[PDB]
Motif scaffolding. Structure first.
Motif, PDB file in Angstrom:
ATOM      1  N   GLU B 183      87.668  31.247   8.446  1.00 41.39           N
ATOM      2  CA  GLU B 183      88.501  31.307   7.439  1.00 41.39           C
ATOM      3  C   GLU B 183      87.431  31.024   6.045  1.00 41.39           C
ATOM      4  N   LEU B 184      86.286  30.199   6.339  1.00 39.91           N
ATOM      5  CA  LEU B 184      85.440  30.230   5.223  1.00 39.91           C
ATOM      6  C   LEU B 184      84.839  31.721   4.927  1.00 39.91           C
ATOM      7  N   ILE B 185      84.706  32.441   5.624  1.00 36.78           N
ATOM      8  CA  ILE B 185      84.196  33.704   5.388  1.00 36.78           C
ATOM      9  C   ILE B 185      85.309  34.754   4.722  1.00 36.78           C
ATOM     10  N   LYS B 186      86.497  34.254   4.935  1.00 37.27           N
ATOM     11  CA  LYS B 186      87.420  34.981   4.111  1.00 37.27           C
ATOM     12  C   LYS B 186      87.345  34.551   2.665  1.00 37.27           C
ATOM     13  N   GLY B 187      86.978  33.622   2.369  1.00 46.22           N
ATOM     14  CA  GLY B 187      86.808  33.016   1.033  1.00 46.22           C
ATOM     15  C   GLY B 187      85.695  33.817   0.502  1.00 46.22           C
ATOM     16  N   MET B 188      84.525  33.789   1.245  1.00 43.27           N
ATOM     17  CA  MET B 188      83.327  34.555   0.572  1.00 43.27           C
ATOM     18  C   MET B 188      83.606  36.096   0.564  1.00 43.27           C
ATOM     19  N   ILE B 189      84.516  36.591   1.432  1.00 40.35           N
ATOM     20  CA  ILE B 189      84.837  38.100   1.059  1.00 40.35           C
ATOM     21  C   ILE B 189      85.647  38.175  -0.428  1.00 40.35           C
ATOM     22  N   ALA B 190      86.565  36.931  -0.508  1.00 45.89           N
ATOM     23  CA  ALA B 190      87.186  37.100  -1.779  1.00 45.89           C
ATOM     24  C   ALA B 190      86.306  36.942  -2.936  1.00 45.89           C
ATOM     25  N   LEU B 191      85.179  36.202  -2.640  1.00 44.11           N
ATOM     26  CA  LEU B 191      84.327  35.715  -3.946  1.00 44.11           C
ATOM     27  C   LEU B 191      83.434  36.986  -4.095  1.00 44.11           C
ATOM     28  N   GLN B 192      83.256  37.898  -3.027  1.00 42.21           N
ATOM     29  CA  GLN B 192      82.298  39.073  -3.405  1.00 42.21           C
ATOM     30  C   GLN B 192      83.295  39.898  -4.151  1.00 42.21           C
ATOM     31  N   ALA B 219      88.800  31.001 -10.169  1.00 39.83           N
ATOM     32  CA  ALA B 219      89.306  32.366 -10.736  1.00 39.83           C
ATOM     33  C   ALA B 219      89.365  33.320  -9.572  1.00 39.83           C
ATOM     34  N   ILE B 220      88.666  33.258  -8.266  1.00 42.14           N
ATOM     35  CA  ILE B 220      88.985  34.029  -7.421  1.00 42.14           C
ATOM     36  C   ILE B 220      90.391  33.864  -6.910  1.00 42.14           C
ATOM     37  N   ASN B 221      91.104  32.972  -6.906  1.00 41.48           N
ATOM     38  CA  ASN B 221      92.388  32.470  -6.505  1.00 41.48           C
ATOM     39  C   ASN B 221      92.495  32.876  -4.930  1.00 41.48           C
ATOM     40  N   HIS B 222      91.431  32.286  -4.041  1.00 44.35           N
ATOM     41  CA  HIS B 222      91.831  32.415  -2.619  1.00 44.35           C
ATOM     42  C   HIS B 222      91.611  30.982  -2.252  1.00 44.35           C
ATOM     43  N   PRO B 223      92.472  30.370  -1.141  1.00 48.30           N
ATOM     44  CA  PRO B 223      92.710  29.121  -1.102  1.00 48.30           C
ATOM     45  C   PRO B 223      91.126  28.655  -0.416  1.00 48.30           C
ATOM     46  N   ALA B 224      90.492  29.412   0.555  1.00 48.20           N
ATOM     47  CA  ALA B 224      89.433  29.047   1.158  1.00 48.20           C
ATOM     48  C   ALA B 224      88.286  29.336   0.146  1.00 48.20           C
ATOM     49  N   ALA B 225      88.264  29.850  -1.026  1.00 46.15           N
ATOM     50  CA  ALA B 225      87.336  30.169  -1.943  1.00 46.15           C
ATOM     51  C   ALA B 225      87.231  29.000  -2.898  1.00 46.15           C
ATOM     52  N   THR B 226      86.761  27.844  -2.517  1.00 46.02           N
ATOM     53  CA  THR B 226      86.386  26.780  -3.137  1.00 46.02           C
ATOM     54  C   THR B 226      84.760  26.533  -3.244  1.00 46.02           C
ATOM     55  N   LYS B 227      84.370  26.130  -4.322  1.00 48.70           N
ATOM     56  CA  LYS B 227      82.940  25.977  -4.662  1.00 48.70           C
ATOM     57  C   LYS B 227      82.386  25.384  -3.481  1.00 48.70           C
ATOM     58  N   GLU B 228      83.054  24.178  -3.042  1.00 46.13           N
ATOM     59  CA  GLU B 228      82.256  23.294  -1.722  1.00 46.13           C
ATOM     60  C   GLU B 228      82.285  24.228  -0.716  1.00 46.13           C
ATOM     61  N   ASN B 229      83.330  25.055  -0.179  1.00 43.80           N
ATOM     62  CA  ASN B 229      83.465  25.650   1.044  1.00 43.80           C
ATOM     63  C   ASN B 229      82.428  26.787   0.731  1.00 43.80           C
TER      64      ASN B 229
END
Lengths: 372, 372
Positions: B183-192, B219-229
Motif C-alpha cells: 500500500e505504501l508502494i501504491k502511494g509512490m506510484i501516485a507520486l511518480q 497535491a497527489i491526493n492518494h491516501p497512502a501518498a503522505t510525506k511520512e509514508n
RNA sequence: AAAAAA
C-alpha cells in the motif's frame, strides 16, 4: 482420364479451388486431379478440403494425392518422374501456385518444355499467367458460394436467417422502440438471464410462454423488471403476451441489432450476394464449435465476420475489445484456419480516447452509431 | 571483385544476413553482393537494412541492388542475363532462399548448370542446402548481435542496463521489501504520476524529500501518498532520503521487477548470451518510437520481448491483456516490422478462466508468480 | 515475399 490437372498443396486452399473451377468450367470434360502435397499438409487434410470444395462426382473427376518433401527438389522431381512414367495423358495442366518454393521449382523444371503440357501461375490479385508454352494472361475469377469457401477449410456450419421482424420494421425499430425504453430493456435483459426463465424454456415443450398466467417470479430481479413492465415492453415490440417465445426475448435484448445488420447487408451492400450472407452462425471443425453473429463472403471471395454489439457502455471498452480480438485471432484464426475481414458494429458512439478506438490498429473495422 | 554473392530480397532480411555472414566468415575475401529486389521491398529499404546489418567497409565489399517484377519470370531472367553478360567472375554464389516464388524460380533456372556457380537454399529451421553443383548440407548457424538483428530491420535503439540494485538484492527484494509494503508502494506510484514531482525532475537530478513541503504530497491526493509514508518506503528500499533520483522512484514503482527479470536472464538463462540482453529499451524507426521493458536475442537468433507487470490485481485483466496485445501486434509488428516471441512476466497469480489466461492463445507466454 | 497465392 485423358486430361490431368496438377496442383501443389499448401496452407491456402482457395487458389487451388479457383484454378480447378476455372479449368473445369471452361472445358467440361472428365479429368484427373493430381495433388502434390507433404506431410504437414496432409496432417491438416488439405487435399480433402480441396476435393470437398469442388464437390465433383468421382465418376467424372478422379482425385489422387502424392507426397513429397517440401524442401527436397530431387525428391519432388523423382516422384513426378515416377508418376508420369509411360503415361498416356493427352493434356497435362500444371498450376505451380501452391506448395513450397522448392515444390514449385521442381514442378516447373520437370514440366517445362514437355509435350502436351501447359504450366500456369496465379499471383494473388493479378491475372492467371500461362508460363508455358505460351506467355499470356487470362482473367480468372470463379465466384465461390459460402459453403464452398468453408468446405475449403474443412468447416461445417449451421445458421438461422429467419428474422423476428422484417427489414422495414428493423430499419426504424431503434428510433421508435429501443431509444426511449433503455431502462425497460435492461429489466428484460435480467429476465433472460434469470435461471427460472432460462430453464423454464424446456426447448421442445414449453416453446411458448403466456406472460399473463404467471405470478411475481419477476421478484428475483433487477428493479425495472416488474411483471407489468415486462408486459409493457413486450407489447411495445408488438409481441403476443400470451405466447412469448425465447426468440422474442432475444430480439428485445439485442437480437434486433443483429437482424438489422444482417438485413442491411442483404438490402444495401452491393459487393455482396445475399445467398452468401448468414446470421446466427455456428461453425464447427473437429471438436471446436463457435458462434458468429453475421458472416458473409463478398463477390471477391473474401470472408467478412461481424460482431454485433448493440450498445457498449464505455466502462467495458477493454472487455469488448478483448472478446473481439479473442474471437478473431485465437478462435477464427488459430483453431479454424480462417483469414477473414473483421468488423465490430455498434449503435454506441466510439470516442477517440477510448480503448475501442484502438480496434482499427488491430485490423478491426468499427462501424459505430455515426455510421448506422 | 572476383567473387559475387547473389541474394533475393523479401520481407525477412535475417536469412540473407545470415547467409552473407556465413560465406564471408568462411572465405574472408573481397566480394560483391548482388541484391535482386522489387519495388515493394525497396520502398521498405530492405537492401539498405541488409547492408547495415553486415557493416562491411565499401573498400572490401561492394553492394548493388537490381530491380525486377516479383511475378515476372521473363523479366527476372532478362535482368540477370544483362547483369552477367560477359562477366569474368571466378566464383558466383547464389542464395535463392528470399524473394518471391517466381524470383527464386527464375534465379534457379538462370544459374543452374552455369560454370563457376554454386546455388544454395536455406529451409527455415533446417540446415543450409547446396543445390548445385553438389547436393550436400552445411552446418550453418551464424549468431547475430542484438545490434545486427535490429539494424536488419532499420531500427535504432537505446537502452539502460545499469541497475539500481544488484542481482543478490533483487533476488530477495520481493519477500523482504515489496510483499509487506504494497500500500505504501501504491502511494509512490501516485507520486511518480503527479505533475509536480514529474516536472521537478525535468529541472533537477535529485530531490531531498525531507525539505519538500507537505502540501505537494497532499497535491497527489492518494491516501497512502503522505510525506511520512513516502519517506518510510524510500528508507525500506535503502535510499538516501536527502538525495532521491527519479530512477529511485521508478525502481520502487516497478523497476525492481524489470531489473529482476533482466538479471535473472543474464544469470540463469542458458540459450541466451548476456551481451544480447537489454533493459529499458527505446526503439526508433522513422518517426515511430516506443519503449520495451526487457528484450533479448537468443542463440537461435530469435528476438524475445517481455512485458514486465509486477502485479495485476484481477480487476485490471482486460486492460493489461489489451495493452500487451497492442504493444505486440499494433506497434512491434505493424509499425516496426518485428516478428518476436512475446512474454508477459508478473508476480501475480494468474488464475484460470480469467482474461489474462487467454494470452497463451494469442501466442503470449505468461510466467506468473508460480514461476518467479 | 526463410516458414507453404500474398
Amino acid at each position: 482420364k485423358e486430361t490431368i490437372l496438377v496442383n501443389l498443396v499448401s496452407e491456402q486452399t482457395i487458389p487451388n479451388v479457383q484454378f480447378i473451377k476455372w479449368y473445369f468450367n471452361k472445358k467440361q470434360t472428365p479429368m484427373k486431379i493430381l495433388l502434390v502435397s507433404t506431410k504437414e499438409m496432409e496432417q491438416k487434410e488439405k487435399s480433402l478440403f480441396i476435393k470437398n470444395a469442388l464437390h465433383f462426382s468421382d465418376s467424372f473427376v478422379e482425385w489422387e494425392t502424392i507426397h513429397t518433401d517440401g524442401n527436397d527438389i530431387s525428391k519432388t522431381e523423382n516422384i513426378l518422374t515416377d508418376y508420369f512414367r509411360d503415361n498416356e495423358y493427352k493434356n497435362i495442366i500444371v498450376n505451380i501456385t501452391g506448395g513450397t518454393k522448392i515444390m514449385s521449382l521442381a514442378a516447373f523444371d520437370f514440366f517445362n518444355n514437355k509435350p502436351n503440357t501447359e504450366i500456369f501461375y496465379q499471383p494473388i490479385g493479378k491475372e492467371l499467367q500461362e508460363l508455358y508454352p505460351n506467355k499470356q494472361k487470362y482473367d480468372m475469377f470463379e465466384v465461390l458460394s459460402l459453403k464452398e469457401y468453408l468446405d475449403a477449410h474443412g468447416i461445417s456450419y449451421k445458421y438461422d436467417n429467419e428474422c423476428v421482424k422484417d427489414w422495414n420494421y428493423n430499419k426504424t425499430v431503434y428510433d421508435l422502440c429501443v431509444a426511449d425504453n433503455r431502462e425497460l430493456i435492461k429489466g428484460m435483459i435480467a429476465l433472460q438471464n434469470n435461471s427460472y426463465f432460462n430453464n423454464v424454456y424446456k426447448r421442445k415443450d414449453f416453446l411458448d410462454f403466456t406472460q399473463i398466467e404467471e405470478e411475481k417470479f419477476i421478484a428475483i430481479n433487477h428493479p425495472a423488471a416488474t411483471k407489468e413492465n415486462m408486459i409493457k415492453i413486450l407489447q411495445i415490440f408488438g409481441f403476443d403476451v400470451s405466447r412469448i417465445e425465447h426468440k422474442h426475448i432475444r430480439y428485445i435484448t439485442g437480437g434486433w441489432f443483429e437482424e438489422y445488420v444482417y438485413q442491411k447487408i442483404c438490402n444495401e451492400y452491393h459487393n455482396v450476394d445475399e445467398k452468401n450472407v448468414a446470421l446466427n452462425v455456428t461453425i464447427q471443425k473437429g471438436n471446436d464449435k463457435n458462434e458468429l453473429d453475421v458472416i458473409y463472403l463478398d463477390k471477391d471471395n473474401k470472408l467478412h465476420v461481424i460482431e454485433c454489439k448493440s450498445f457498449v457502455d464505455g466502462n467495458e471498452g477493454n472487455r469488448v475489445l478483448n472478446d473481439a480480438l479473442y474471437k478473431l485471432q485465437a478462435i477464427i484464426k488459430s483453431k479454424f484456419g480462417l483469414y477473414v475481414k473483421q468488423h465490430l458494429y455498434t449503435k454506441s458512439i466510439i470516442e477517440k480516447e477510448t480503448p475501442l478506438n484502438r480496434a482499427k490498429e488491430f485490423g478491426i473495422d468499427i462501424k459505430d452509431g455515426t455510421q448506422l
